[PDB]
């Protein structure tokens, strides 16, 4: 399943960046699931149906001003997750965007460790694949560099030898033409005195 | 000084896993960093040069073999044929590890534990470093792919140019030959005409 890290920031501790890797679901037009963590407990629960259709288009608003913000929300968000309320409610106090987005039932499950275990397993697998492909492409790039270098070299030798032969032929032909011109000039000189 | 984490996953239970963010130089015979935690509390610790000579004297082995064993055990990698019994005895409240082979009990090492006071920060920095090295590896991967394809069609183009040059070198040399021949022939014709003109007196 597709999963991407979306780290969040706290107000009490603005320096501790809690790396929250959010787990989502299929296209957001038919329901969406957000993930939350705090570093001391794990919560990963998916929402159900019968919650999206009723609340989406009942207040008579344009469809764009909701779907556009929904799509731009994933592709700074003041996540005001407060432990005093234990609810994922955050005010969208952002310039030109001030509205409530997302009716979330806060995530709560019985197995907290499984999500973390699978996440770290995927991280290790992708690291290993990364180094493997890095090494493979390293040898490929190096061998292609050597092939380019020695092909360039052999081209250099062949062109240089051909050009040296061409220069020799040109010089010999120039000398022969100069001799012919001198002979013609001498013949004309003798013909003049004839 | 890089950091690597290898998950040793017991087939019997998936609850406990070991994190080894060891900072090592080109030797492993002194104090290092090992971390063990369950998710709420952590117990780190280091072992000095106290009990290592027995593992070189009893079975009369020298260094390097132990270094290689440490390097291929602490890092990632395991053998399906050789089962590993990582018995962490929580019920007896006594921390020790054993490596069983040929139905005999031997020694491998000792690790006393001292509880660390800041596990959250080190774990967060560890996961951040893991994400950073994933990003770096992926960037190097895409750059290497780009250079791979670039040198690939560079080789294609230079091979095509070489084939063109070796095909056209004979043609150009023949063109030069024929041009020189025609120039010499017209020079001979000029000499013939001059000879005919000088012949009459």
From Swiss-Prot, chain A:
Tissues and organs where the protein is expressed, per its UniProt entry = Widely expressed.
Q: Which keywords does this chain's UniProt record carry?
A: Chromosome, Coiled coil, Cytoplasm, Disease variant, DNA damage, DNA recombination, DNA repair, DNA-binding, Dwarfism, Isopeptide bond, Nucleus, Phosphoprotein, Ubl conjugation
Q: What is the effect of changing residue 69 to R?
A: Does not affect interaction with NHEJ1/XLF
Instruction: Give a GO molecular function annotation for the protein.
Output: enzyme binding
Q: In terms of one coarse class, where is the protein primarily found?
A: nucleus
Q: Which residues form a coiled coil?
A: 124-158, 177-194
Subcellular location(s) per record: Nucleus; Chromosome
This protein's record includes keyword DNA damage: yes
Q: What is the effect of changing residue 99 to E?
A: Abolished interaction with NHEJ1/XLF
Q: What is the effect of changing residue 43 to R?
A: In SSMED; impairs the protein function in DNA double-strand break repair
Q: What is the effect of changing residue 186 to D?
A: In XRCC4-Asp mutant; phospho-mimetic mutant; abolished ability to bridge DNA
Q: Which residues carry this modification: Phosphoserine?
A: 53, 186
Per its UniProt record, which disorder involves this protein? Short stature, microcephaly, and endocrine dysfunction: A disease characterized by short stature and microcephaly apparent at birth, progressive postnatal growth failure, and endocrine dysfunction. In affected adults endocrine features include hypergonadotropic hypogonadism, multinodular goiter, and diabetes mellitus. Variable features observed in some patients are progressive ataxia, and lymphopenia or borderline leukopenia.
Annotated protein name in UniProt: DNA repair protein XRCC4
Q: Which organism is it from?
A: Homo sapiens (Human)
Parent-record interval covered: 1 to 201 of 336
């Amino acid at each position: 399943m597709e999963r991407k890290i979306s780290r969040i920031h706290l107000v009490s501790e603005p320096s501790i960046t809690h790396f929250l890797q959010v787990s989502w679901e299929k296209t957001l037009e038919s329901g969406f699931v957000i993930t939350l963590t705090d570093g001391h407990s794990a919560w990963t629960g998916t929402v159900s149906e019968s919650e999206i259709s009723q609340e989406a288009d009942d207040m008579a608003m344009e469809k764009g001003k909701y779907v556009g913000e929904l799509r731009k929300a994933l592709l700074v968000y003041t996540f005001n997750f407060s432990k005093e309320s234990c609810y994922f409610f955050f005010e969208k106090n952002l310039k030109d965007v001030s509205f409530r987005l997302g009716s979330f039932n806060l995530e709560k499950v019985e197995n907290p460790a499984e999500v973390i275990r699978e996440l770290i397993c995927y991280c290790l697998d992708t690291i290993a694949e990364n180094q493997a492909k890095n090494e493979h492409l390293q040898k490929e790039n190096e061998r292609l560099l050597r092939d380019w270098n020695d092909v360039q070299g052999r081209f250099e030798k062949c062109v240089s030898a051909k050009e040296a032969l061409e220069t020799d032929l040109y010089k010999r032909f120039i000398l022969v033409l100069n001799e012919k011109k001198t002979k013609i000039r001498s013949l004309h000189n003798k013909l003049l005195n004839a």
